[PDB]
Design an enzyme around this catalytic site. Structure first.
Site, short mmCIF file in Angstrom:
data_model
loop_
_atom_site.label_atom_id
_atom_site.label_comp_id
_atom_site.label_asym_id
_atom_site.label_seq_id
_atom_site.Cartn_x
_atom_site.Cartn_y
_atom_site.Cartn_z
N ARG A 15 -39.77 -33.07 -47.99
CA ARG A 15 -40.50 -31.99 -47.37
C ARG A 15 -41.36 -32.55 -46.25
O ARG A 15 -41.46 -33.77 -46.07
CB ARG A 15 -41.34 -31.25 -48.41
CG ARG A 15 -40.49 -30.42 -49.42
CD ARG A 15 -41.43 -29.84 -50.43
NE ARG A 15 -41.90 -30.91 -51.29
CZ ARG A 15 -42.58 -30.74 -52.42
NH1 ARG A 15 -42.91 -29.55 -52.85
NH2 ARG A 15 -42.95 -31.80 -53.11
N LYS A 74 -47.44 -35.15 -49.88
CA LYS A 74 -47.80 -36.05 -51.01
C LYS A 74 -49.04 -36.88 -50.75
O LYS A 74 -49.54 -36.95 -49.65
CB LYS A 74 -46.65 -37.01 -51.30
CG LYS A 74 -45.57 -36.43 -52.11
CD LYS A 74 -46.03 -35.15 -52.71
CE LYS A 74 -46.11 -35.24 -54.22
NZ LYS A 74 -46.68 -33.97 -54.83
N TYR A 93 -51.52 -32.90 -51.26
CA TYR A 93 -51.60 -32.95 -52.71
C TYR A 93 -52.07 -34.38 -53.03
O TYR A 93 -51.45 -35.36 -52.57
CB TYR A 93 -50.21 -32.78 -53.28
CG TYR A 93 -49.75 -31.35 -53.36
CD1 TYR A 93 -50.46 -30.39 -54.10
CD2 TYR A 93 -48.56 -30.96 -52.74
CE1 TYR A 93 -50.01 -29.03 -54.19
CE2 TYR A 93 -48.08 -29.62 -52.85
CZ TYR A 93 -48.81 -28.67 -53.57
OH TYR A 93 -48.33 -27.35 -53.66
N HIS A 95 -53.96 -35.31 -56.49
CA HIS A 95 -53.86 -35.58 -57.94
C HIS A 95 -54.68 -36.86 -58.24
O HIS A 95 -54.19 -37.80 -58.88
CB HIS A 95 -52.34 -35.76 -58.40
CG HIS A 95 -51.53 -34.49 -58.39
ND1 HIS A 95 -50.87 -34.02 -57.26
CD2 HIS A 95 -51.22 -33.62 -59.39
CE1 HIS A 95 -50.23 -32.89 -57.56
NE2 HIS A 95 -50.42 -32.63 -58.84
N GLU A 117 -54.24 -28.84 -54.45
CA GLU A 117 -54.24 -28.39 -55.82
C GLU A 117 -55.56 -27.95 -56.42
O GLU A 117 -55.57 -27.42 -57.53
CB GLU A 117 -53.51 -29.41 -56.72
CG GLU A 117 -54.33 -30.73 -57.11
CD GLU A 117 -54.26 -31.89 -56.07
OE1 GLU A 117 -53.69 -31.68 -54.98
OE2 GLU A 117 -54.80 -33.00 -56.35
N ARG A 202 -49.48 -9.54 -71.36
CA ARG A 202 -48.54 -10.15 -70.45
C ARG A 202 -47.19 -9.59 -70.80
O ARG A 202 -46.45 -9.15 -69.89
CB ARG A 202 -48.56 -11.66 -70.56
CG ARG A 202 -47.63 -12.40 -69.56
CD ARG A 202 -47.86 -11.96 -68.11
NE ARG A 202 -46.89 -12.58 -67.19
CZ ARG A 202 -46.89 -12.48 -65.85
NH1 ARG A 202 -47.81 -11.77 -65.22
NH2 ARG A 202 -45.93 -13.07 -65.12
N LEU A 239 -47.01 -24.09 -68.48
CA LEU A 239 -47.53 -25.02 -67.54
C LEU A 239 -49.00 -24.77 -67.30
O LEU A 239 -49.43 -24.35 -66.22
CB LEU A 239 -46.71 -25.01 -66.24
CG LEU A 239 -46.76 -26.37 -65.55
CD1 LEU A 239 -45.40 -27.06 -65.52
CD2 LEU A 239 -47.35 -26.23 -64.16
N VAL A 268 -42.73 -31.27 -67.72
CA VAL A 268 -42.46 -32.73 -68.07
C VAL A 268 -43.46 -33.79 -67.59
O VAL A 268 -43.84 -34.66 -68.36
CB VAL A 268 -41.00 -33.30 -67.66
CG1 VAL A 268 -40.00 -33.21 -68.80
CG2 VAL A 268 -40.50 -32.74 -66.33
N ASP A 269 -43.82 -33.76 -66.31
CA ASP A 269 -44.72 -34.78 -65.75
C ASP A 269 -46.13 -34.71 -66.29
O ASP A 269 -46.85 -35.72 -66.30
CB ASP A 269 -44.73 -34.74 -64.20
CG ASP A 269 -45.35 -33.46 -63.64
OD1 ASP A 269 -45.21 -32.38 -64.28
OD2 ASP A 269 -45.96 -33.54 -62.55
N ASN A 299 -40.69 -32.72 -60.30
CA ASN A 299 -40.77 -32.19 -58.97
C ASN A 299 -39.48 -31.42 -58.60
O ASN A 299 -38.78 -31.77 -57.68
CB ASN A 299 -41.02 -33.29 -58.00
CG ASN A 299 -41.34 -32.76 -56.67
OD1 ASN A 299 -40.46 -32.33 -55.94
ND2 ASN A 299 -42.62 -32.57 -56.43
#
Lengths: 361, 361, 361, 361, 361
Positions: A15, A74, A93, A95, A117, A202, A239, A268-269, A299
């Site tokens: 990206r 990133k 981003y 993190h 984020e 929901r 998530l 997962v991450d 990702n």
């Protein structure tokens, strides 16, 4: 203002910080943009496209990092540590609660770093993450279908079936954004779909989207066990953006699934609701446990950089412009932006990150 | 009657002549069935499942070929030539007009061979092919989506897009069974879809299925050129079951497509409407021509053997039973069966095959 | 209380202050209603219908203006200035920031005047305007279709096309109430539809209404240019109720459109997002610029007075009743009503209007 | 011609030979109609309604039977044997292969009797039965829902469930007219639906009606067993209009169903595909076998006489008119009518009925 | 904590305080559960099912009432007054403002009693009532259909009609939760549907659910009269949870309805918007007034105890767990719970109930 866009150097990141349409928009507001050659190429944007838009195409990353504002996708990597400058604005981003060194590194240098984020609204929605969560929900079903093919390792089931033959069963754990985009795709391929969630309200809203085409179920252990045991495709979509999810799917449950069934967990991450699932590499995307196929590549949105870059830009854009116009004052006009601020003048400003490196504060 | 089912030995063939439900049905009518161990395994049917149903599981192919009727999916291979017997009934896909040796071989031996693909109704519909054509239409979109992912080689486009971003464009050449199942899937993923066909009446019927959600266009050179030039996914669905298709898509047209676009032609093994597309292997499924990705792996339905075996059986079943009950008389009770007859007592009986090996007649 | 309803005298205004159903309702609460003969006729309500409901039908406007409350649709005109009285309550659309004289005039007289258009809720929604905005959105497509007919001046395109032929393309600028009602109609006629908006959240909500049937795009210059150039019908739906809209469609863009294309801008009287569009008269509704047809007749809802009168009444009714019951106290029970107050006892009370005639304050 | 309509005297029969709209139509073509008082009342048609239409209302059945053509719904009963006349035309449902006496009786008298149920088209469709088959399919679900209520004897399940709770499962055996109308209703209440059929082409057509909202399955013993065991509502819809249906549902299967489950078999009076189901009376509509509720009341359409009378008339009408105009010649202009002829001048003319009373021929 | 569940003893009450899935969940959190034998049976839950889940099955109600927390569906009855204990927590539907004695009784004893029906959110939504309101809306149409059958007393109309015949007309007064669930079912059966409401915003939201398939009308006397006069099924759905509803349907209006029409009013026990409708018994569910059938049996959800028990539990569950964990402190952590508190230590704490027994306070 001067704005640079370096090419993403992280592995498998295709990206780019700004698309040609964004650039053009930015240029029409006075600002001038510098983009490293080939920066847009993995996303389907040639330099020419950047030129028509008003960008100055630069031959090196150094020429792109040297500006007042750097806009990326990133986090910066060690290789680029030496290209950063003292009074930049960095918007990408980050993190940080996971990269001590990066965090220290930005502290030494002294720029102000804003994380996509953490820019958060009064509702506590994270407007700059949602776009990626939508894409990930949609992809989960596309990947799942692929791994159900016999040559890919699955049992060999077509999700939609054919008239006279049973369709595939898709079980989705989590009724939020991700889980809902996933259901849209599965229903689209003709599958039989069940969604579990702990929030009835929901569940009620979902009925307004799907009518009676999908099974809308309350998440309780008993129903989960039965459902899961019958699934061809299990999708983890809890998530919850901070701490790991409770395990909804224990290894014992997984031993009860059919051979050639597939599991995909969008979380997962960060940590999923499926006990046996851990991250995997691009080179070996899946593994088996009990004859059940596990896909753990993270990702997901990185697979569709053309779509993903525009989606991200549609959301970041108004922020990029505010920053280019008002510089550092925007943080005092915009609360959400204010919340995105993580590091400034050698200080760790983000409360959540301070909590993690309490001694960095 | 005694019926055998050997395991398919062709490379990458995982389907099986009869599923457990068929077997059970056959057993309830008196007949007794012998199946080679592991025969059902690639399709997701264990021997145990065959036992519950009333089948006798045999340890060798020889034990399965030695029966009065052998029911298979693919044509016999040289390796099995010596297992065949003089008065058998053979029922499977043969495609004799392409295998001189096989044809001679069945002639020497002297059994009667019935091809699934020539059993034809008064309408000239081929009831035993349709099931596979439906699956292939549905898969075309699933494969296409996969190859549009950046890591797979495509431009990186999500077919459905996301609100605010353009969806992918899918262009389908051919409005028949294949083309229509393909449109169903593409529309299901949220893509923008165009279907071309030369039959207006067919176009009219399609509107009753899709309303105004899909663009229904007359196939003329001019419109094809424009459409094709803008496509992310091009699907060839002109599968006229005899001779090759006219080229609707010439190499010149392909040079005009975007880089990272994908082409899938359902008619690859027979000859497609896309000039540049030729068959490829499982090991190297795709290739590029002008930066445009070509997928040429044939026998799409082989990817979903569980679904594909049942679909085929739902259609062959009533024929298998008629044959087991009446033996050779069924050919004189059933016209469609009569039409499936290709070889009997050393004679080539199929008019179309005679035309190809006019000297074999 | 005594309530009068004079016949609308503005040119081409056929609506009426109260329908027969409203009257009846008002009568059941004690109040007595006086309506000038023929007042309801342009909207399809005969005097007889007013009689069955409990209204006293009056022969002159003077007999209708002479009451404590006058309920109308349009602003009073000079011709009626002399019929107004000192302590009346006037409830109608006023649009004072555009009529200095009217404003002064109501000031001299000394009644209290409440404007439908300023009665506003805590959300800042204008409950008494919405009904008309919905109708206008729906009509935009009905007018557009008419002007695309060859005899009306357009290129001669049927919006829905026919199977085998391309449908018309409708491009809508603005994803709010107007733009959304317009899309509903266009999709209903079978057209291909694109909607642009700058609010992604709005785009997201629209997907819950239309699924993937409509293209939902972020408004950026680049995409707008392409879209617009390909449109058969362009609809301006940015009706931001204060100041004029930014020009999204410049004359240069309009020169790029096909000949016989049509533009309709719902915001014409206030100022649209299309450079070349200005108001026109009923007698000459359209004009050409670059071979592109422009429709500029304002007050679209006036074309359907039967529908428009009831829609308006369903919304004004609870207010009319509150006023008839509590008289002037309702302004101190109802905040929204309080906000509708524009003039009272010779004083200009509306903050926004004061800002315009700062010397009238 | 003179046409009479006596009141139906069979127990629980509320329908009537002609509705008021039919009468009016018949009158406009010259014919004159005589209807016994109260004849229309059970269907919601008062005598007054018959008068406005041009009917002469008669005080006795004798006055209605005395005409050239008598138009009824059910077969004549012994009580009326003496009202019949020698040269009448009788048009109603007869079902002679089940009433030796009735058959002899019509033979003695010597009129010509035409049965609605044998008037057949070249396709072998029975145009005068279909209307009732449609209604019966729709009612099956309405009755089923009622018996699933706890007080009615069922397990207490709402077919549609509520968000968060499982919906009811409806299993339909037979994909024809009846089975398809039933699925429409079940899907309408929000149930999860499975339809089984042995005709794949039929399954294929059903997908064009329901898309992927319903499970479309091939009828084989194995799948039937599983499905049935999980059902809340089982509907038998194999109404093959001659001989009884094969038992698809054996008592052993029924013992495997949940307690409070319900079975409805549309083919009860003729013989169903469910072993344990036999006809019951209005007074005691249901019974239990294994804790499974059985509803066996026949003639479902009799519950909705208003709807049922018009539906029948829409279909019989063109025949009634042809008969009134051409008298007995219509049988030689109309093949379908010709096929409806069962008895004439003391002779048994219907080939199928002759086969049953071979000695009556 | 120790939790008991006695069997419901009220007449025709078949639901149960906790289902097996809830129990299991409660057990996994430490708590231990005691359930009286046969308690679950009317809802379809055998004791065995309670055992697998971890419940201790008790032989007497006394053994179930003797615990710290008793979880029920209905209010305690005199017969059980002597089983209650001093420091219990009681959680069930109480409806104290209607039972002076019950109220006094709980006061004497001294436990703390929490009513499901008063636990209220900041919005003033009553989360523990909604589930039942949804079911009641859905049932209204199922009952209505049944009473329109001729044998049940109605005119004999099938709601959906058949092609060529008019469908039934359903008129719904009230556009809230109940009225909306009812419309869903009626539309599902194919009926023609009109919904009236006084809130336009609500009408607007309903259009997003139904599109143009249903008529959405403003509730005014005039339109109501016409609509009602033409209805086959009239459904009262104004269930304003405090005081009785204004009569929207006066006896005079009812005299104007067709004979065999049906009325169902969901608000019967509380007081409906239909003048002539009063509660009836199970034994005689309906009565006629003007030839119009009235169904007045209350507690509609009691007909589907299996569905109703789970629906209720999905909502009460998180509260039951909070209470079992924190005991009485939860009232000071949870505002909604706090609001459910009605009686504690001999004191009447609920403000609304105090208002009714102002001298009990």
């Amino acid at each position: 203002m001067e704005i640079g866009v370096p090419k993403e150097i992280k592995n498998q990141e295709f990206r780019v910080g700004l698309s040609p349409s964004s650039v053009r928009t930015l240029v029409e507001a006075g600002h001038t943009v510098f983009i490293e050659t080939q920066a847009g190429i993995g996303a389907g944007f040639a330099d020419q496209d950047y030129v028509q838009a008003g960008a100055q195409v630069v031959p090196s990353a150094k020429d792109a990092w040297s500006r007042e504002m750097v806009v990326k996708v990133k986090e910066p990597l060690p290789a680029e540590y030496d290209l950063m400058q003292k009074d930049q604005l960095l918007f990408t981003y980050l993190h940080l609660a996971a990269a001590r060194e990066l965090t220290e590194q930005l502290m030494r240098v002294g720029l102000t770093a804003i994380a996509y984020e953490t820019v958060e609204l009064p509702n506590r929605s994270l407007p700059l993450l949602t776009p990626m969560s939508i894409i990930a929900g949609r992809l989960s079903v596309q990947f799942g279908a692929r791994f159900l093919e016999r040559q890919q390792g699955g049992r060999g089931v077509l999700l939609g079936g054919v008239p006279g033959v049973k369709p595939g069963k898709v079980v989705i754990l989590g009724g939020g954004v991700v889980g809902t985009e996933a259901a849209k795709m599965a229903v689209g391929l003709g599958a039989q779909v069940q969604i579990f969630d702990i929030n009835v309200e929901r569940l009620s809203y979902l009925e307004t989207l799907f009518g009676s085409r999908v099974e809308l179920l309350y998440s309780n252990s008993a129903e989960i066990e039965t459902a899961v045991a019958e699934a061809d495709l299990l999708i983890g979509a809890v998530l919850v953006p901070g701490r790991r999810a409770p395990i909804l799917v224990p290894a014992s449950l997984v031993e009860q699934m059919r051979t050639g069934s597939v599991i995909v967990d969008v979380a997962v991450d960060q940590g999923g609701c499926v006990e046996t699932l851990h991250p995997t590499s691009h080179t070996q995307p899946t593994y088996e446990v009990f004859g059940v196929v596990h896909y753990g590549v993270p990702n997901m949105p990185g697979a569709v950089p053309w779509t993903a870059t525009q989606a991200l830009n549609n959301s970041t854009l108004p922020y990029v412009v505010k920053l280019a116009n008002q510089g550092l004052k925007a943080l005092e006009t915009d609360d959400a932006l204010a919340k995105g601020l993580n590091v400034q003048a050698h200080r760790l400003v983000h409360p959540a990150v301070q909590q993690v490196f309490p001694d960095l504060a």
